[PDB]
Design a protein around this ligand. Structure first.
Ligand SMILES: C=C1/C(=C\C=C2/CCC[C@]3(C)[C@@H]([C@H](C)CCC[Si](C)(C)C)CC[C@@H]23)C[C@@H](O)C[C@@H]1O
Ligand SMILES: C=C1/C(=C\C=C2/CCC[C@]3(C)[C@@H]([C@H](C)CCC[Si](C)(C)C)CC[C@@H]23)C[C@@H](O)C[C@@H]1O
Lengths: 9, 240, 240, 9
């Protein structure tokens, strides 16, 4: 669920 | 016969974004798991890529417009294009001398034989290196390389994008910038824009082949365990 | 006043399993992401632990009986107890001289201050080190340390176990081995078995506190991204 | 789903 991408974004 | 303000701003903000997210000394590489020369090189290169994805995200966030896309469109574009921006940004480390990405001494110098030892066959590395030598021959200005990365990122024709009209309108604006920049600022560059556009279609074909071989890798737990949580997120297929 | 054959076999196979999965030279540590002294030490220690989980699995597979448990019971016991076997096996690197795990020179020597820089508070590291110094004082035979690890792994009272009767019957057999081994082979060890049993209950209390702080960590993507795919699998809560 | 554990086991 792109937990890291969201955070990085 | 002259760029706009909003034109030169786009170049300025893109070029600065690149400087902030690309170290020409490759001095953070010592923090990766070391290279080893099975798939001996998979740990080091997995970290190489994951570090790189972190940078491509930083660049992306400063492309004008990108910030205002939905979180879902940002993810969709990053997931589908990350490997292309990495292949793109690596040209700045690629050496026509050696046919290798020379990020350091003998350790962070990456033969084609190193990337085999991360589980990639020649049916990928061969056109990968033709792409790299071609891209190097184009002797791009910083202004063009940066623009080429941004245009590649803002492609509407990627799986999962929802606002393909707003995205395409952003990609359009950037293409207009590259056409104009080359027209005015690059002497002898009358075939350049078209050759740069060609490099994108090569990237899609690299992307495809790489996606195949990543799947074969990602499906073997003994190999996927050597990857990072960011790599599996970005190259995985969770979908939103 | 004498061990059985099946007794001495259990000791032999356990002791050999330990030798095969624990390097006293800590010579593979150079392949981890280096230590750094935010959470500067999280990358190196995450790799330390992940490497260790790989070893604890190797040990586990050679405990007699374990192989014949269902894949689900093996996973349940490993997931709930891995951190305990790691705390256990680390005693062999812990130095009463220094109050640190000395796996190398100044780099792989781990102060309590290093583990803070991986996101652990003293409410964990304090009893962790009391546990370690206590366990070191017990001056365990290799035969006992190995047995203590196996007994800890084969606990029926762990979340997710399904065949708690077969597991407990395996744990029972091993306790009988440790009681008998100490009775016969360890002079002056008439309170030892009971002190060793005490060390298990300390492990549960460490386990609990560590599980709390891991959750807080694992819930912050900027920190969980520094972990490995194996660590998130084993310490995560997927359940079967 | 413990894809790695299964493999390792
Ligand atoms: C990444 C960069 C650099 C080099 C990139 C390289 C050289 C090594 C092999 C790589 C990585 C290719 C592989 C086919 C990709 C494999 C991906 Si996986 C290990 C998850 C299977 C893609 C790009 C290649 C250095 C510097 O220019 C910074 C830039 O960012
Ligand atoms: C692991 C071993 C060794 C050392 C273990 C150590 C020292 C560093 C801090 C650790 C790791 C604790 C922490 C509280 C645990 C943190 C786990 Si996370 C980084 C995923 C948040 C648990 C055990 C501790 C060396 C050798 O004896 C081999 C053995 O196997």
């Amino acid at each position: 669920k792109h937990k890291i991408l969201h955070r990085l974004l | 016969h002259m760029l706009s303000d909003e034109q030169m701003q786009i170049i300025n903000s893109l070029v600065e974004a690149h400087h902030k997210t690309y170290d020409d000394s490759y001095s953070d590489f010592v923090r990766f798991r070391p290279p080893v020369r099975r798939l001996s090189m998979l740990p080091h290169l997995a970290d190489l890529v994951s570090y790189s994805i972190q940078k491509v995200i930083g660049f992306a966030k400063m492309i004008p417009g990108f910030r205002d896309l939905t979180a879902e469109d940002q993810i969709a574009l990053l997931k589908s294009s990350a490997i292309e921006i990495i292949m793109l940004r690596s040209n700045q480390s690629f050496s026509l001398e050696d046919m290798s990405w020379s990020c350091g001494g003998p350790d962070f110098k990456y033969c084609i034989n190193d990337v085999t030892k991360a589980g990639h066959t020649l049916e990928l590395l061969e056109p990968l290196v033709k792409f790299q030598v071609g891209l190097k021959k184009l002797k791009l200005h910083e202004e063009e390389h940066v623009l080429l990365m941004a245009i590649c990122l803002l492609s509407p024709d990627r799986p999962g994008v929802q606002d393909h009209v707003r995205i395409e309108a952003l990609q359009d604006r950037l293409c207009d910038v590259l056409q104009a920049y080359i027209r005015i600022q690059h002497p002898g560059g009358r075939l350049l824009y078209a050759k740069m556009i060609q490099k994108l279609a090569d990237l899609r074909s690299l992307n495809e082949e790489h996606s195949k071989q990543y799947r074969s890798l990602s499906f073997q737990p003994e190999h996927s365990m050597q990857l990072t949580p960011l790599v599996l997120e970005v190259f995985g297929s969770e979908v939103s």
